Design a binder for this molecule. Structure first.
Ligand code: FPW
Length: 257
């Protein structure tokens, strides 16, 4: 849920002193946005335009207007934006944090629950595909959990080990290239947040994939889920499924299991 306008009132926003995470953009802080009867916990991305870039404002506003229309629940949605002491991108909070670190710390999560989470990710990706948006950086670190039963895709475009051969070779990014990344993501998920291609460098992964070699079936991963991973890793981009086909397969599978 979003208020009518994209611009939020800075006086209605409270930020935590502690930062959730930093980087070469700014930082992400936990916040609280005051609405009529309730208070909504939010994750606020803060952009200090340190080099006073005149181009930033236009870029951010064009993005916010696109974000205001992206309503699917399987994505981290924008609450709004505010031009205060810094630009603040007020997003939904996904309390449990990244999928990979979550699974790592919670080895008790069942295969059924992992299947549910990966199906929600394919629902979010199907939605982005339908909207002509390519993620470019789809990975388990980029799936944030609101609950153990509610996953949201973050930081979509608007990681060589997650790249489709045509990304590394011909610099071709598409939703089908994101399907390859979704295959790696499914591997990370069923592997409980373990690192893909452990100890390998990006050049070695390429050489491995050209041999027709793929990562093996994770311990306890259902066979049909490993088969779907492997289909996401179809070398030829023309025979690799899109997200509508992947989501429908996960959808049928989930409602039987
Ligand atoms: C528990 O720990 C965490 C929970 C979190 N819960 C939700 C969001 C978080 O951070 C994010 C992730 C992505 C984006 N942003 C995005 O996903 C994003 C997607 C697309 C476009 N734009 C630009 C834009 C947004 C809004 C307006 C204008 C431009 C985006 O920022 N912003 C903040 C969290 C971070 C955490 O720790 C580090």
């Amino acid at each position: 849920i979003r208020p009518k306008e994209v611009y939020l009132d800075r006086k209605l926003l409270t930020l935590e002193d502690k930062e959730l995470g930093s980087g070469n953009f700014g930082t992400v802080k936990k916040g609280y946005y005051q609405m009529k009867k309730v208070v909504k916990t939010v994750a606020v991305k803060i952009l200090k335009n340190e080099a006073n870039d005149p181009a930033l404002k236009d870029e951010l506003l064009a993005e916010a207007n696109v974000m205001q229309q992206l309503d699917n629940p399987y994505i981290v949605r924008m609450i709004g934006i505010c031009e205060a002491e810094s630009w603040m991108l007020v997003m939904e909070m996904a309390e449990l944090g990244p999928l990979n670190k979550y699974l790592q710390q919670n080895r008790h999560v069942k295969d059924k629950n992992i299947i549910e989470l990966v199906h929600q990710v394919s629902m979010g990706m199907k939605y982005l595909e339908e909207s002509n948006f390519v993620h470019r950086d789809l990975a388990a670190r980029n799936v944030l959990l609101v609950t153990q039963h509610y996953a949201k895709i973050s930081d979509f475009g608007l990681p060589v080990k997650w790249y489709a051969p045509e990304c590394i070779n011909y610099y071709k990014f598409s939703s089908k290239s994101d399907v390859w990344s979704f295959g790696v993501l499914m591997w990370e998920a069923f592997s409980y947040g373990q690192k893909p291609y452990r100890g390998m460098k990006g050049s070695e992964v390429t050489a491995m994939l050209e041999k027709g070699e793929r990562m093996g079936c994770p311990a306890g991963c259902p066979r049909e889920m490993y088969d779907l991973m492997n289909l996401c890793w179809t070398y030829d981009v023309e025979n690799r499924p899109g997200f509508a086909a992947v989501e429908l397969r996960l959808r049928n599978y989930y409602y039987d299991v």
